[PDB]
Amino acid sequence: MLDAFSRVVVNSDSKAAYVGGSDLQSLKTFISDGNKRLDAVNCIVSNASCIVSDAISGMICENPGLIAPGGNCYTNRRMAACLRDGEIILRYVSYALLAGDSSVLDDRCLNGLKETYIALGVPTASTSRAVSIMKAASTAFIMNTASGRKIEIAAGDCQALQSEAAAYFDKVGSAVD
Amino acid sequence: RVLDGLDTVTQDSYSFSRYVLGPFQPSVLNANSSEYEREIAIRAAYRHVFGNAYIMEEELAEVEVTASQYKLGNLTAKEFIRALAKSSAYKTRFFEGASQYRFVELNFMHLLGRAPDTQEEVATHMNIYHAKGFDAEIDSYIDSEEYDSVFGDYNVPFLRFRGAYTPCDSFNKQCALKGGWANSDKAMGGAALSGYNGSDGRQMCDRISAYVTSDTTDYESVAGNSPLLTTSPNWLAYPDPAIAPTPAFISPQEVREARARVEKLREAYNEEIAKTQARKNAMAPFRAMVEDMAPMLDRGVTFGDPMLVHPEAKLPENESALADLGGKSSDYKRFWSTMETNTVSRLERDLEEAKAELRVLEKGVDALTPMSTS
Amino acid sequence: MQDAITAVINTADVQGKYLDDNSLDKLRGYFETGELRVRAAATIAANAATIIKESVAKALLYSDITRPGGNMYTTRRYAACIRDLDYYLRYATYGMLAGDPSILDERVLNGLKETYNSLGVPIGATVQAIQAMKEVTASLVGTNAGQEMAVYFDYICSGLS
Amino acid sequence: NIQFSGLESQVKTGQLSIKEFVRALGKSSIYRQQFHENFVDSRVVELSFKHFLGRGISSLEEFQKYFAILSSNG
Amino acid sequence: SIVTKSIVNADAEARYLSPGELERIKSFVLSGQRRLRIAQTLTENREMIVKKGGQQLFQKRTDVVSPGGNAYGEEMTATCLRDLDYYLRLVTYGIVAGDVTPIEEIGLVGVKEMYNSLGTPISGVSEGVRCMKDVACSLLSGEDSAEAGFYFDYTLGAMQ
Amino acid sequence: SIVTKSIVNADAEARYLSPGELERIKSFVLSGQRRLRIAQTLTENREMIVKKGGQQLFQKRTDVVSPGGNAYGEEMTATCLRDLDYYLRLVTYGIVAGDVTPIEEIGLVGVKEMYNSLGTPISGVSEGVRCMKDVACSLLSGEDSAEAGFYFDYTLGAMQ
Amino acid sequence: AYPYTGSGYGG
Amino acid sequence: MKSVITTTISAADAAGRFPSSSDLESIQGNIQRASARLEAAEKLSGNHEAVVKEAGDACFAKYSYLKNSGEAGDSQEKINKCYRDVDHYMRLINYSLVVGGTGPLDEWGIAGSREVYRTLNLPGSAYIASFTFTRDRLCVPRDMSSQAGVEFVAALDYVINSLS
Amino acid sequence: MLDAFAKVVAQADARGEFLSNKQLNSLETMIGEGNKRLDIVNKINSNASTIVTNSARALFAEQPQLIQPGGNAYTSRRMAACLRDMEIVLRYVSYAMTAGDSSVLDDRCLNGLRETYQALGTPGTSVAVAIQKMKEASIALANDLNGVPLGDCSSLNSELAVYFDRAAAAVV
Amino acid sequence: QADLPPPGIPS
Ligand SMILES: *[C@@H](C)[C@H]1/C(=C/C2=NC(=C\c3[nH]c(C[C@H]4NC(=O)C(C=C)=C4C)c(C)c3CCC(=O)O)/C(CCC(=O)O)=C2C)NC(=O)[C@@H]1C
Ligand SMILES: C=CC1=C(C)[C@@H](Cc2[nH]c(/C=C3N=C(/C=C4\NC(=O)[C@H](C)[C@H]4CC)C(C)=C\3CCC(=O)O)c(CCC(=O)O)c2C)NC1=O
Ligand SMILES: C=CC1=C(C)[C@@H](Cc2[nH]c(/C=C3N=C(/C=C4\NC(=O)[C@H](C)[C@H]4CC)C(C)=C\3CCC(=O)O)c(CCC(=O)O)c2C)NC1=O
Ligand SMILES: C=CC1=C(C)[C@@H](Cc2[nH]c(/C=C3N=C(/C=C4\NC(=O)[C@H](C)[C@H]4CC)C(C)=C\3CCC(=O)O)c(CCC(=O)O)c2C)NC1=O
Ligand SMILES: C=CC1=C(C)[C@@H](Cc2[nH]c(/C=C3N=C(/C=C4\NC(=O)[C@H](C)[C@H]4CC)C(C)=C\3CCC(=O)O)c(CCC(=O)O)c2C)NC1=O
Ligand SMILES: C=CC1=C(C)[C@@H](Cc2[nH]c(/C=C3N=C(/C=C4\NC(=O)[C@H](C)[C@H]4CC)C(C)=C\3CCC(=O)O)c(CCC(=O)O)c2C)NC1=O
Ligand SMILES: C=CC1=C(C)[C@@H](Cc2[nH]c(/C=C3N=C(/C=C4\NC(=O)[C@H](C)[C@H]4CC)C(C)=C\3CCC(=O)O)c(CCC(=O)O)c2C)NC1=O
Ligand SMILES: CCC1=C(C)/C(=C/C2=NC(=C\c3[nH]c(/C=C4\NC(=O)[C@H](C)[C@H]4CC)c(C)c3CCC(=O)O)/C(CCC(=O)O)=C2C)NC1=O
Ligand SMILES: CCC1=C(C)/C(=C/C2=NC(=C\c3[nH]c(/C=C4\NC(=O)[C@H](C)[C@H]4CC)c(C)c3CCC(=O)O)/C(CCC(=O)O)=C2C)NC1=O
Ligand SMILES: CCC1=C(C)/C(=C/C2=NC(=C\c3[nH]c(/C=C4\NC(=O)[C@H](C)[C@H]4CC)c(C)c3CCC(=O)O)/C(CCC(=O)O)=C2C)NC1=O
Ligand SMILES: CCC1=C(C)/C(=C/C2=NC(=C\c3[nH]c(/C=C4\NC(=O)[C@H](C)[C@H]4CC)c(C)c3CCC(=O)O)/C(CCC(=O)O)=C2C)NC1=O
Ligand SMILES: CCC1=C(C)[C@@H](CC2=N/C(=C\c3[nH]c(C[C@@H]4NC(=O)C(C)=C4CC)c(C)c3CCC(=O)O)C(CCC(=O)O)=C2C)NC1=O
Secondary structure, eight states, X not given: XXXXXHHXXXXXXXXXXXXXXXXXXXXXXXXXXXXXXXXXXXXXXSSHHHHHXXXXXXXXXXXXXXXXTTSTTOSHHHHHHHHHHHHHHHHHHHHHHHXXXXXXXXXXXXXXXXXXXXXXXXXXXXXXXXXXXXXXXXXXHHTTOOSSOOOOOOOOOOHHHHHHHHHHHHHHHHHHO | OOOOOSTTXXXXXXXXXXXXXXXXXXXXXXXXXXXXXXHHHXXXXXXXXXXSOOOOHHHHTTSHHHHHHHHHTSSOHHHHHHHHHTSHHHIIIIXXXXXXXXXXXXXXXXXXXXXXXXXXXXXXXXXXXXXXXXHHHHHHHHTOHHHHHHHTTTOOOOOOOOTTOSSHHHHHHHHXXXXXXXXXXXXXXXXXXXXXXXXXXXXXXXXXXXXXXXXXXXXXXXXXXXXXXXXXXXXXXSSOOSOOXXXXXXXXXXXXXXXXXXXXXXXXXXXXXXXXXXXTTXXXXXXXXXXXXXXXXXXXXXOXXXXXXXXXXXXXXXXXXXXXXTOOHHHHTGGGSHHHXXXXXXXXXXXXXXXHHHHHHHHHTTOOSSOOOO | OOOHHHXXXXXXXXXXXXXXXXXXXXXXXXXXHHHHHHHHHHHHHHTHHHHHHHHHHHHTSSSTTTSTTSTTOSXXXXXXXXXXXXHHHHHHXXXXXXXXXXXXXXXXXXXXXXXXXXHTOOHHHHHHHHHHHHHHHHHHHOHHHHHHHHHHHHHHHHHHO | OOOOHHHHHHHHTTSSOHHHHXXXXXXXXXXXXXXXXXXXXXXXXXXXXXHHTSSOOOOHHHHHHXXXXXXXXX | OHHHHHHHHHHHTTSOOOHHHHHXXXXXXXXXXXXXHHHHHHHHTHHHHHHHHHHXXXXXXXXXXXXXXXXXXXXXXXXXXXXXXXXXXXXXXXXXXXXXXXXXXXXXXXXXXXXXXXXXXXXXXXXXXXXXXXHHHHSSXXXXXXXXXXXXXXXXXXXX | OHHXXXXXXXXXXXXXXXXXXXXXXXXXXXXXXXXXXXXXXXXXXXXXXXXXXXXXXXXXXXXXXXXXXXXXXXXXHHHHHHHHHHHHHHHHHHHHHTSSHHHIIIIITTHHHHHHHHTOOHHHHHHHHHHHHHHHHHSSOHHHHHHHHHHHHHHHHHHO | OOXXXXXXXXX | OOOHHHHHHHHHHHHTSOOOXXXXXXHHHHHHHHHHHHHXXXXXXXXXXXXXXHHHHHHHHHOOGGGTSXXXXXXXXXXXXXXXXXXXHHXXXXXXXXXXXXXXXXXXXXXXXXXXXXXXXXXXXXXXXXXXXXXXXXXXXXXXXXXXXXXXXXXXXXXXXXXX | OOOHXXXXXXXXXXXXXXXXXXXXXXXXXXXXXXXXXXXXXXXXXXXXXXXXXXXXXXXXXXXXXXXXXTSTTOSHHHHHHHHHHHHHHHHHHHHHHHHSSSHHHIIIIITTHHHHHHHTTOOHHXXXXXXHHHHHHHHHHHTOOSSSOOOOOHHHHHHHHHHHHHHHHHHO | OOSOOSSXXXX
8 A cells, every 4th residue: 555655755765765856746746636636535435325326237237137047146145245346346446546546456456356256256347347337427426527416616627637536447447357 | 133143144243233333343464565564463463362461572583483474475364373372472371371261261262252152162172172282272263163254364353242142141251351451361360470570370260150150240340341341432321331439438327328219219110100101192182182173273275475475374385394283493302301301211310320329339338347437 | 709800800919919911911811802792691681581482492391390290390380490590591691791600609509509409409400401591592692602601501500510 | 560589589498588588678779769769868767667677766866876877878 | 278378367367266267167168068069060071161162262362273373283282272271170179179279379370471481372371261261151050150260260360 | 871870879879979980971971972873863764663663563473463453453553553653762762861771661660560451462562672673773784783773672671 | 209399289 | 433533543553653743644634624614513503403494394395105104204203203313313413523534423323223224114215315405405605614515515425325 | 005015025125134934924824814805805895885875974964063054064065075085095995905004095095184184174083983984884894794605804804993993093 | 104104205
């Protein structure tokens, strides 16, 4: 687990020298963009149960073989687990939004996922579809462009941050596949 | 059914018990972690496995090989605990100087996280001792299916606040066997005091009588030094769960007064309950009268604005589902002020305060001969 | 009794000194809060009736107390009850506007605990009625003056308990 | 509609004796507004005997006694 | 009671009871069973008095049961008729007591301060008790409802 | 008045006026012109306050102008608005006096005995004075209607 | 259970 | 209760160290964000009673069947319990809003709510109807300040996502 | 003319030192106050005509001297000059409310004004009563909770009151 | 600098 700060520090220790101007300049930009980051993660830790519900429901409706017998969303138990796993994926993505570096997501969650879903028999393409639905829903929440929710916020461009969040979801969806 | 099963079968039990409040939760070395995370999880392990016992840096070298192997991630955490319990450290704290009841009881605490249920179980694990030594005891505790199911390979053992509890007395045990956050195992057992120079001290056991025969540990031992108390959730129970400290200068007159008070309060209590059944709906005959004359009193809405409606005519907006009876802010706010207002409720709290005081006396009256009477 | 000013003249007088800078800082504190105390007392004077009505409605009515055998049963007792809530509100305003709770020591809390324990007035219901007046009164006068009235209502509740 | 409710209640408790109730009634502003404001200090003296003792002035030296108390000290 | 009032009376006069007052106690203790008949009838006919008196009250006075009045809703109307039941109970106490002392000290001393603290119009309370007086006079004899009706008249005079 | 109250106070203490009370008289006599402005404005706006306050009274409280109320009829309504005119006049007297002694001795001492002898609900009178307080606070400034409005508040505290 | 002291008619 | 102070103290306790400058910066942030949230709590304790009225009246405005049969709203008394539980939740929003973490709202309201609401036939959809009504009746400009409003939205969000 | 800072810079050059970090912290604090400042000046600039008009109504009502023949505000010329002078003083108190310094209001309006209103025979204390009325209306207007986020603004109302008290102090 | 400055002499 490393933030943006520890990323600067680690890079400068690989270089084995002082911190200096330019790295600190980029980190100053991190601090001044801090409140937008705050409000974005707040937007994703807001309606998130709503996100996981809609995304897994969308994943079953797009691909009806999940709910079919002998699918991995068939039994009620298995449905509980899939929802829990959707929740967890969105959770670690939210951590990666706060940290600003994907060290936490790579070390805590991403490392054992491909082998694990293979060892359980979980269909991976379906999971990556659910990660994609969480991606699009999360970018729509993070841009204030959800239909059912439009909350007023001090205005500004936030494209950087949207592309950041989409980078983490693409890291997960590319990781399960 | 509110709940599915025991600690092992489902974890609904953990969710609405004291478990959530406590720092008695599992700890994991997550992937590649820095010294801050390694050192955290390794100390939380040392606190649980030695029961807050005190490991000098010399005694850490004993455990060091195994510590390094866990810092890898080569060893699972259960194999780490296995290597901790097989260490000569852990033998010296516990196996070397203990009676067998005490000792077996300990490896339930450190290994399983629970107090032993029955005498038969305790005897089973002792028979495993005389079969194949200290080593196969430790192996038997770690390789148990209940252990694996509850903790898994990862999680360091903790005190399980599973609301199931097979025997209540085993709960009272489990709070008694771990004496709160300040205490440790050398304090609970006089290993240090008995031993010369803080060492070679035989471990004392209590509650043997409660394993053997059907007994109960004291409210004191569970109330003074407990995970119940350290994980205190700041409760406004008029019941105090904390024991009142023993007052000095107790006289027998003070105690006959309190006993007599408790008995008077019990009598008044039973009378008031028996009436309480009698209350029914005293208000109900008048309620039925108003239900009868409903066609006169009940009135339909006029659809309009604040302007242009005859006065005292209800608008469909002011069909509040609490204005329809005529209740108020008070009426929803009433049951929160009920402790003082209610007679029965008032009596119950008095009873309990009186009982707590009575026990605190029963301690203090015990002292005889040399008491400065006051 | 004594206000904050009289208390300053008591300490400075009982030392024999004159007024030093500390005592003048205390007088400046009181003279800063002066106007706020005045308008708070004005508002409470305006809405005493509604404070007592709302607080009795929240705290005491439709319970065992106004049901028969409770202390509030009969008209004479009800009127004595709401009369006592009027005294707590009025003397709490005096204590606020003086800035010193010595009036509550002199003319209210003297012998009151012996009175209520003599009669059989429930202490806890009285305290909850006073706290109901504290919430309603703080809602009328606002934040700062609600803090000031809060320390004097809490002073009476500490007096009875 | 004049009601003195705490003098009344401190008498109903025996906290004020009935002498002190007559005292606190006699020192209230309704007593002075009723009997002191419209009358001369000599007449205030006389009416204070009617109300507080239930008799007239016995004699001249007693009037010269109490008139000094009223007249010098309110 | 009459006994209480006589004893208190010659007690404050610090004398024995007069022959006059003892004749008053004799006339009282001989008038007993007639009084117990009256309060027996008003006891066993209380539901007609409370119901019918409440109907004549709400029909004469549509203020308080209108939306925005004090007695609007089912719970509030039930409490209104509950209070009329109280004043009927106290009138029966005053009949067997042979004096209004029970009625005055249980019900009337400080009633205006109570209902002004509740927001209740006390003139509507007096109209309610007058309605129960008319029903209770419909349930009794001539001289009988004169007596009982006059105890109701005392309560009306205390409310107004 | 404040002067009357101070003179009566040290008169019953049989002394001259203290320094404190003389400072109070100074503050009063220097606050005069402001008071006279307020009572000037409430004087010359009386018909708006009585009419508009009567409208808000009867619209909030349709009891007394209903058939069966006290103020039912043209003559009775006129008398009702006549009394609101009285209390408006007395509030202006209390403003120029700097004390509620005019208000109290002309209007408040024994008001409940009078309106109970007339059959009038006095809570309706207090609601009327509160309605005139709202109108008169709509006609003045901030601190100004704080002062005058608080004189109205004294009258409401005397009615309730 | 909690009687209110009354000399006459209080309770 | 999970707050800034309890998380950093508890985390430093688990660490086995003195509180270093990181925890000090955490409580520095608490005393930065404190004013905005406390404005929210003051205004909530201002008009909570009207929040009970509109909240519960919208809650039966959506679902009328609760007043229809014996199920959950048979009497006026159970409706008093309805508005009562709504005021418990608003009071916990006030509490967590003052503390600033979701601690008292979690350990007092959410913990073991599912056994109770499942047991006593209480639907969560009516609660969610109430709270979504309260978040639809929120204006950033008006009432509480925009920063205060944001914190109120966050707390009430956590309520719904706890229940749903 | 000097602004709120121009005073800090001007003193710092009159001694010829730099600005210390203390001074810069003070300036940054006043900037964070500056949104509230602009809000007050917007409220004053909006309702200004009602301030001047109502305050003049209360002036002539409370002092009926000046509307009468022989009084100083007796002619339509003289009355218009009266109202316009009140508009002048309210304009410059708006200016010094923006600047944060009382310099522009002294230099343009107050300094020298007394010599004129003595030289015309105008009673200064009536002008002072006028400015007190604009202070009352202006502060009671500035404490309006309409359209603005709620918040604590006692210091800026205190400062604005210092500007109007300086105006009434400079005519009297 | 509370009082008014001399003629000219902008404060
Ligand atoms: C703004 C986006 C709206 C709207 C807002 C209005 N709200 C009105 C009244 C009102 N609003 C609330 C909610 C508010 N009060 C609180 O205490 C809290 C939180 C603690 C909140 C979020 C309440 C309770 C009330 C009733 C009490 C009151 O009047 O303040 C309102 C007045 C409505 C009216 O009287 O017609 C408005 C206009 N304005 C709009 O244009 C959009 C839809
Ligand atoms: C403790 C919790 C906490 C938060 C939740 C944030 C909330 C927050 N956001 C901003 C401020 C802001 N927040 C956003 C955010 C965005 N605007 C958009 O139009 C996008 C929808 C969205 C993308 C994330 C923007 C653009 C600003 C203003 C620009 C900026 O301040 O950088 C501010 C500045 C002060 C103010 O505006 O009043 C604050 C405090 N900060 C905190 O301390
Ligand atoms: C920290 C991160 C973290 C994760 C990401 C998850 C990943 C994960 N999922 C499962 C387990 C599971 N995960 C799913 C989920 C699925 N159901 C389907 O229909 C889809 C293919 C898919 C959702 C998109 C299911 C159904 C199980 C249970 C599988 C089974 O028992 O058959 C397990 C085994 C343990 C268990 O049963 O819960 C693990 C480790 N767990 C973690 O700790
Ligand atoms: C195997 C048998 C078995 C039992 C019989 C229970 C008995 C039991 N109850 C509690 C614990 C509890 N039990 C209750 C129950 C009560 N609430 C009240 O209002 C009533 C007085 C009473 C129900 C009639 C409560 C409220 C707690 C939690 C107490 C607290 O934390 O304050 C605990 C402590 C652990 C926990 O918090 O769950 C135990 C051992 N547990 C077991 O394992
Ligand atoms: C600290 C937080 C806290 C809460 C949030 C409540 C939640 C809660 N509500 C009830 C209990 C109840 N809650 C309701 C409420 C309802 N009536 C309906 O028509 C609606 C569906 C709903 C209101 C929207 C009812 C009717 C009961 C009683 C249920 C019954 O006895 O049948 C109970 C069981 C104990 C009791 O009977 O009071 C609890 C714990 N209590 C708490 O301590
Ligand atoms: C160009 C002109 C111009 C203005 C006139 C202001 C107007 C203005 N004020 C505020 C914002 C504000 N304005 C005030 C002011 C007030 N405090 C109170 O006690 C009083 C009611 C009031 C002063 C009289 C406050 C307190 C805020 C912050 C509100 C909040 O965050 O809660 C904001 C939102 C941005 C911010 O937070 O600064 C704006 C646009 N801004 C401008 O750009
Ligand atoms: C730059 C700043 C600046 C000012 C502050 C004014 C000051 C000022 N006022 C007047 C002139 C005047 N000012 C007033 C004002 C008054 N009417 C009264 O009843 C009150 C006493 C008083 C308002 C409070 C009147 C009435 C005149 C005209 C006097 C006359 O002609 O008799 C004149 C002479 C020129 C003229 O007639 O306009 C000047 C210089 N002019 C300026 O250029
Ligand atoms: C300001 C100075 C002052 C105070 C405060 C005061 C209190 C006071 N309260 C009294 C009685 C009482 N006080 C109460 C009060 C209550 N009952 C309830 O249930 C409520 C919970 C509670 C009020 C909140 C009741 C019922 C009585 C009457 C007891 C009786 O005589 O029957 C009495 C006895 C006199 C009487 O009222 O008959 C005094 C003297 N007296 C004073 O001089
Ligand atoms: C508040 C209105 C008021 C007044 C004025 C008043 C006067 C008053 N003057 C008295 C006596 C007296 N007053 C005087 C006065 C005077 N002797 C002279 O030669 C002078 C002309 C004059 C003094 C200027 C004398 C000598 C006596 C006593 C005479 C005696 O006792 O023999 C007495 C007799 C008893 C007593 O004083 O206590 C009264 C009551 N009482 C009142 O209530
Ligand atoms: C005998 C001794 C005695 C009496 C008389 C008495 C009266 C009394 N009336 C009460 C309320 C009430 N009283 C009424 C009465 C009326 N509403 C109307 O519109 C009618 C005009 C009027 C009756 C004629 C109503 C509606 C309430 C309920 C107010 C509320 O709590 O919601 C209450 C508050 C407790 C409750 O009922 O919930 C008391 C204590 N209490 C006593 O201990
Ligand atoms: C200066 C102090 C003062 C006051 C206040 C005063 C009032 C007063 N009010 C009266 C009548 C009245 N006053 C009212 C008032 C009202 N009716 C309602 O329902 C409302 C609550 C309220 C109006 C707000 C009514 C209806 C009457 C006549 C009732 C009747 O004659 O039947 C009368 C009867 C004869 C007459 O007016 O000439 C007096 C003397 N007298 C005084 O000297
Ligand atoms: C019939 C089977 C079925 C579903 C289930 C949905 C699932 C679904 N949600 C989407 C996408 C989606 N979903 C949500 C979340 C969702 N919307 C909200 O406003 C709130 C409050 C939500 C949770 C309750 C959002 C915010 C989006 C982005 C689109 C939008 O702006 O609404 C998308 C678009 C994916 C993409 O862009 O590639 C799909 C397919 N679609 C289906 O065909």
